[PDB]
Every structure is written in C-alpha cells, then in structure tokens.
Subunit: 125 residues, 4 copies
C-alpha cells in the first residue's frame, strides 16, 4: 500500500531528512530537517499524494512544501517538491523542486531556483 | 498583514479558482477548482507560507500542492506551485509550477511538466 | 512558412529584444539585447528549431542559448529558452527559461533559476 | 583551459552521447546521439559557453539546444540544457533541461517537460 510505503523517514543524497505521515485521504504531514537533525534546522512540511490502482509498476504522484521559517530562522523563502514514490526493497521518492525567495518587483525575474533530489530509506555515508 | 492579504479567493488567467485560508503558524489550506466551479473539478490543497517583516516591498514566499484525486477523478498526478504574494489594490500571487504524473521507470524522464500562472483577486472575462 | 515567420525581431514584455535568423537546416542565429539596444547589452545567441508539417495549428518547437559574455560584461552565466513559435497576425514565441550561474560545488544547489517570457513582433510601451 | 576541457565526448547516466567542440569565441557545436550511436539517433546541437577567470573552483556556465529532427525522425520537439562544466580527473557537466513539444493553444499548458542529467567523460555500464 502507498500510504504504508510513504509514511516514515527519507534521506536525500546529502542526508537531509524528510519525516512524513501519509494520511488516508491523501494528506502528507511532517518535518524536513538536515542531517545533524537539530531543531534549529527542522521545518514543517505539508503536501498531498495521489494513490491510484497499482498498474505497470507506475509511481505514486505527490508533492509538498516547506516554508523556511522556524523558531531559529526566517529565510523569506519556500520550496516545493513535485515527484513520485516508487516502492520496493530500493524504494525511492524522485523529485524536482522549486525554491522561491520573497523579492522586490524589479528582482522577481530572479526569485525562483530549480533543482532535483532523490530520497531513499537508507541514510547515506 | 500577510495572513490577511492571502486568505480568500484567487483566479488565474483562465479563471481557475484557488480558495485559501492562511493560518497564523504558516499553514495554507483550501480548495483548487476550475472556473465553472463544479465539485467535479474541486480538489484539496495544502501548503505553507513564510511571513517576514515588510521591507523593500518584498513579496511573501509560499507554495502549495494539489493531488489530482477527488470523488470524480483520479489523474494519477500532483501539481506544486511555488511563488510569492504581493499585496495592494492589484494584489497578485506569481507562481511557477511542476506537475508530476505517476509513470513507469522507463517513462520517468517524461514525468514532470513545468509552467507558470499568475493569480489575482478579480475573476477575468 | 516557419523559417519565414521566425526570422526577424522579437520583443519580450520588458522590450528586451531577440534578433534571429532561422536557417533552412534548422539553425537559429542572432543577437539578444536589451530595450535601449546598446552594444553594451548585446550578446550572441545560437539555437535550433524543429519545422514540421502544419497540422492542428500546432506551434514550432525551438530553443536557444545566450552566454552572458560580450566585450563589456562577463556574468559567468548562460540562459537557455525552450518554447514554441505560433504564427499569425498576433505571432508569438512562448518560452520557459533556465539561467545557470558558474558556482562552487557547495553552491551548485543554487546555480539554476527558472522563469518564462513571451515574445511578440510589436515593441511594447 | 575551459575550451580544452569541454571539447570532446560526454555521456549521461544512460550513455546518451554528447560530442561537442568549444570554439574560441564561446560557440558550442556538435552532435547528440544515443548509446548505440546509430545516425538514426544523431541530432545537431548548438549552444554557447561563458569562459571566465578560474576562481574558487567555480564551474563554467553553458547551454545548448537539440531540435529533435534528423533524416530519420521529426519529433516536433526541442530540448535545451542549461548547466555548468567542472573540470578535473572527474570532470562533469551538470545540467537541467527543458523539452518543449509543438502543441495546440489549448494543449500549450502541457507543452514543456523539465528534468536533469549529468554528463561525464567515461561511458557507463
């Protein structure tokens, strides 16, 4: 089950850490933090996933957002990740992300970074 | 205030409709639907925003996700929007989006579309 | 004809100016400059277009690159535009772009901006 | 030197093959083909690179375009890659790409895919 396979802890290639609960009606809730795992680097995340009949080994589409504000930092920024969960002994969440910074109208052209990250169940290094 | 300016109804250039509540601790909750506004085309959205001291007329960074599953449709897909809110008599939310479809491993190269949309407070046409 | 409709001068929403020649074997060659049109702001561009039988009023896919180095500036950056030409009395080139800056390995996460621009045949303002 | 380090053959993670010449005045010219290396899968590429003083081990920004038309195929599409070259015994070109398909006005929302690819000097597998 998708809900089952998604819920838990995921690590990117730099061991940033994604702790998520997949709810029965499509909610993703959790925390995004960085490898050393201090509250200083922990942020709320919220998103959604689209569970659908398991055919052709298709991944499960999902997305989430982190606003980069906690009790220690206010980066005036938010990232969204869009991707898919694929289950199995080598389960992965493959994503592309957008990071937008709060900017002036004149600097808004330069407000949005794009990148990618791949999450697995095993902490690297 | 950001929380105040964001909460409400927003329309893209095609009159797709975004109904959001901005919570005090950074949550975005609401519905994303399309112009004719039938429940058939209404989906849950969830996201986050980063409120920060109003300086240099900087926008407020935010993001949200829609998983394209409701009681009428299951598109096996999710979109994330990343952008910024700018307030005023011509308030806007400027976004870039990523749409990921659930795909096979062989088709995963072609899983993610990118685009943009601008939301305003006034319904077009 | 595509080759015919593309060749010439195009303007974005800020009147940045794109002067292109579409070659018979798919080449795009020209200059990208900014509204005031000084050599100081003029850069070489090169790209490709895919001419294909005119069916269903489909656009013509194309792309180009500008490296942000001329005799006046070296921004250590390059932009690529990917989009499509659509002909007619309101001809347009609709694009999405990626801007990459030369960065350190530690800063490479933050190396690539994304945006969009729409070009028309008529100089705005 | 940048011009020297870039010119040659590069392979992505699937062994698609990028054969490029970096010119003295910033041109990239070459062929993009797929692992088996048949003319059927070989396409022209053209782009630009921004050589700049070697400081802080910064990469060299570059971009290129392939229109997906050759004597065997006309995919009505073009891809642009935006990224940076980093030299050394483990030289790499890290990219993000945009693929645009020629579409109708109604389907133009869904015209552009985004992804990433990393090129190295050594053919995988």
């Amino acid at each position: 089950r998708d809900e089952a396979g998604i819920t838990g802890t995921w690590y990117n290639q730099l061991g940033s850490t994604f702790i998520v609960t997949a709810g029965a009606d499509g909610a993703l809730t959790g925390t995004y933090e960085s490898a050393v795992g201090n509250a200083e680097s922990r942020y709320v995340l919220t998103g959604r996933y689209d569970s659908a009949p398991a055919t052709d080994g298709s991944g499960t589409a999902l997305g989430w957002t982190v606003a980069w504000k906690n009790n220690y930092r206010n980066a005036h920024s938010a990232t969204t990740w869009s991707g898919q969960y694929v289950g199995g002994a080598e389960a992965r969440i493959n994503t592309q992300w957008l990071l937008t910074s709060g900017t002036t109208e004149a600097n808004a052209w330069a407000s949005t970074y794009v990148g990618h990250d791949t999450f697995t169940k095993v902490k690297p290094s």
